[PDB]
Amino acid sequence: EVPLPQLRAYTVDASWLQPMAPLQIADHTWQIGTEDLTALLVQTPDGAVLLDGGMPQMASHLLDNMKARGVTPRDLRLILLSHAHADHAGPVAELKRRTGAKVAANAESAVLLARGGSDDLHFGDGITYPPANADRIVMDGEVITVGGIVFTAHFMAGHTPGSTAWTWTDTRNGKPVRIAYADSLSAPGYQLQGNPRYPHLIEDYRRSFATVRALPCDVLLTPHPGASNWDYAAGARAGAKALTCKAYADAAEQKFDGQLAKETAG
Amino acid sequence: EVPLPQLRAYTVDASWLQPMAPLQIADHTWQIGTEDLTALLVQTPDGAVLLDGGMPQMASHLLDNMKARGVTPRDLRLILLSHAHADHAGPVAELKRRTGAKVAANAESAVLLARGGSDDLHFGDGITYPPANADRIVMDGEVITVGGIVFTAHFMAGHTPGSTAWTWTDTRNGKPVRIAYADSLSAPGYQLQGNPRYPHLIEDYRRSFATVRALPCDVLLTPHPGASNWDYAAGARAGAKALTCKAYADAAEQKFDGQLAKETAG
Amino acid sequence: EVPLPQLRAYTVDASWLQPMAPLQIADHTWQIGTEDLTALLVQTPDGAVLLDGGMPQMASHLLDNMKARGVTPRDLRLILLSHAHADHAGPVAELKRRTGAKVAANAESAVLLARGGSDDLHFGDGITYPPANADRIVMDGEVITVGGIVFTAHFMAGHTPGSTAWTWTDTRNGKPVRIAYADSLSAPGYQLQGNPRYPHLIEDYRRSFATVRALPCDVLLTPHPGASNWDYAAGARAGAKALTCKAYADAAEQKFDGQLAKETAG
Amino acid sequence: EVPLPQLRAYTVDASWLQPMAPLQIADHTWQIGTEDLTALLVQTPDGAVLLDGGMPQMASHLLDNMKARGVTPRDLRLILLSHAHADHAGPVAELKRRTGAKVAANAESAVLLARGGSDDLHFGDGITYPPANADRIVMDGEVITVGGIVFTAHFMAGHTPGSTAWTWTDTRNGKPVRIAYADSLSAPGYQLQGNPRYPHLIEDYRRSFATVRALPCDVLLTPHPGASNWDYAAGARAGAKALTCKAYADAAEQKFDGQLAKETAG
């Protein structure tokens, strides 16, 4: 008669998978992912930090761009994550196997990473990826220092329970630049009200808008560059139109309020 | 010359290890631990729930008291935890091996349980116990239902990041009784201010006092019975002097404020 | 220019995904999977055992067939595995979430199951599935007893390092029937000689042929029924043409020797 | 009346905990543990390898001896283990937190390490230590290369299921030296015959004696130095009386046969 359906692969827009050469953000900070997925390399005298890796199939491209920057596999020391979905943490397990890198994450992100994104609060098993273990668990406001660059975790639960903004200070043209890598604030197809798997979802999103609003934020970057109006294909103008953290938070909250109203009507 | 020190066992007051027979709290709820450590058995037509197990060496005693109540190993379905320290989650791994029980916990408690209490934010490796895996991760406010008894999680971070109050409604003399099993609110020898492993420790404790204050709470129980003025050795009067949740929260906050002042002076 | 390739789903022949009603093998043993993937239910007075679950998307079908047999989710006590590939262990994580079941497996199978089949010795990350944790680790020759049916593990490394045959005695028409659920002995596209990830692959396969040859084996079943000449769609004749364990082992060894010769020539 | 017993710490002979300065074994290989527990440092131009760490409380001493050798925490790349008992893998979790090191182990050792030595086949929970995760799973005969030194795994199951000998070639006075770090072959207080948790224990020990007998073995070292007649406190003569691998295997087999006979009589 009728067989069960075949497994469906997690397929994405081509631009999410379009390799790009490294794009400099500040003196030690580079976008080394694809056109439409952020993966940030921070290079220090004492090794390199990667914030996000994009999709699972991006591991070799990331290692190629690291080599182009002078970062060998042994030199990658630390992987940080915005959140542990397949399109941002996808290649972490493979990167750990192929480099010296260790993962630092909060408890929520660590348990989602360790089950490869399975049993997602909203997506079920529809978006899984190879599982990986965290080497260090971080708390809200905790700092990690690599080669003198100080990364601070700012929890901003909502998109996932473990969603995190990472902030650090780099330099540009001599001057300090406070960089904020703020996580997604979207709720794509989520049940927002009365969700039994996430009862305080709305309150957490509201607190997260306030957290993002208040980040030290000379330059905002986001896991999906379009969310902060970056255009990685635009070269010297890639960041010209970027939002402030305040504008990103306001836009996300306005969208969220509309979704709440639509959910009530639906 | 001088050898490194021997490992030091986690030793406790004798009363913490003094077995007691089951003590009834409500129609389906029993204290089945020791004189000075709580372990709550909730018996339903569809299996039993255990909230905490005490110290690691209490597993066989717990199974004996379950058998006395008519609960076989296959009948124990669910283990819930206040927090994942050795004196409350100690026997969980062994209980999982010897019973049908699965563990539900929040992400913070799950990651501490999975490392057996090692790398504790405050105690280091001084209080370790056999590690166990959680089978279900719960979110704040999430409910779990067993045989018609509904358990609600209320996160109250502080004593550990994953500290949780569990509430449920049982009956007594016909009438509903709202039971609150509130976690510890102590901070024993903790560095409270400017703690790099727990930067928002103080704000979390303050929020947790407010959470405990507001619990549905006809009867308060705590992992250390003395914290809520229970005397499990006092028979029919065991709960006569028990605090309200409001009084427990107020007392813990007053103690906390004194500790803050002492830390500033020290 | 050219984006990285999209993730490719693990797609299989339709017959592997074709639901079937329960097919009785012996008094307490039933095939409850699909036409072309084995999933064995063994029903005892003290709960049920599942050996394999097939593909990830088979969980609900398995639970439906269990209900048809009188097995509720709380009644499923134990999941055993032939090997931890996606087409045999696929739905284990979901089954653990939805039932009382605990998993027993050897160390090799447990570590592959815990990474969801990622970093496979031969397939890489091409065939991943939701990860699950084992509750009990078994050694070679160890027995597990459920409701009086005794399951014995016989390690038969090769197809995976953790490949296992499970044997038990059921009854039929009054008489004992020694059932052997022998794992796959295939090496599909494997590098057999000088494989750096599996240096003793050939010796392990040779020992495994001998193990299978010697199993107590009135009735042979295999994870892919065609490997032992079962036809689950053939009703009362489903097992009529089934191989002996000796014939299955001999056929697998002859195929293996041919593959070795082809590899040398290639 | 009578409380349950206090937890008992894993206490050991003082010499096991007696720090020693680094003792050179070959051009790049050093004993950096204690008088009576081996911990081998292998220094390469591309980072350092540690084989075993001894007891849990030895982590800081090991890091001190590494610094004395010119090995900083970032320079430690790889930890290998003989077997995952507390007196040999004790400090691995802490070393991973404090260094760049990743752990490679076989599946059996990895699952025992991940439960901190709890639920030991023979010792139960009597000898637990902080759990750690393996970063790479190795198969029998697999090689790992660091800075041009090639380490080969030789499984020798018995003392634990995952017991491993590691062999590598260093140099001395110009000439190659084949070093064999063979695991324990003891069975202290073990039930050898008919052990339900280890049914093939005897056959595995017999095979392991043969494996050890056949190792490439110009210099034998063992986790307990006394087992191979090393005296780490004897300076230039520390290794003068060391056994061959053949003599170590023969002595262990003779002791094993005596224990079997005593078990039959007991």
Ligand SMILES: CO[C@@](NC(=O)CSCC#N)(C(=O)O)[C@@H]1N=C(C(=O)O)[C@@H](CSc2nnnn2C)CS1
């Ligand atoms: C798991 O990944 C996501 N789901 C999918 O891929 C397919 S299912 C939902 C849909 N539809 C998710 O988490 O929902 C992506 N990640 C999001 C994020 O915010 O991280 C959103 C990005 S919206 C955006 N903002 N700027 N550009 N784009 C494209 C949705 S897409």
Ligand SMILES: CO[C@@](NC(=O)CSCC#N)(C(=O)O)[C@@H]1N=C(C(=O)O)[C@@H](CSc2nnnn2C)CS1
């Ligand atoms: C890991 O266990 C604890 N530490 C120790 O055992 C020894 S070290 C700290 C000291 N000293 C811990 O967590 O600090 C205990 N658990 C506490 C709790 O609140 O859970 C406190 C209970 S104070 C109390 N209230 N009523 N009765 N008692 C005795 C301290 S004792």
Ligand SMILES: CO[C@@](NC(=O)CSCC#N)(C(=O)O)[C@@H]1N=C(C(=O)O)[C@@H](CSc2nnnn2C)CS1
């Ligand atoms: C991960 O799953 C397997 N690979 C794939 O699905 C696609 S890639 C290899 C190819 N091609 C695998 O392990 O190789 C399957 N499982 C096998 C087994 O023996 O378990 C073999 C079964 S051959 C057979 N014997 N009777 N019927 N069939 C169909 C191959 S198919």
Ligand SMILES: CO[C@@](NC(=O)CSCC#N)(C(=O)O)[C@@H]1N=C(C(=O)O)[C@@H](CSc2nnnn2C)CS1
């Ligand atoms: C977990 O650790 C062991 N047990 C204990 O510590 C206390 S209980 C058993 C007793 N008694 C174990 O595994 O049994 C040690 N490790 C052994 C090994 O072979 O690894 C043996 C070493 S005998 C030796 N050979 N040369 N010197 N020594 C002292 C026994 S001692």
Ligand SMILES: [Zn+2]
């Ligand atoms: Zn996402």
Ligand SMILES: [Zn+2]
């Ligand atoms: Zn996304």
Ligand SMILES: [Zn+2]
């Ligand atoms: Zn505590």
Ligand SMILES: [Zn+2]
């Ligand atoms: Zn306590």
Ligand SMILES: [Zn+2]
């Ligand atoms: Zn397979």
Ligand SMILES: [Zn+2]
């Ligand atoms: Zn298969």
Ligand SMILES: [Zn+2]
């Ligand atoms: Zn040992």
Ligand SMILES: [Zn+2]
């Ligand atoms: Zn030892």
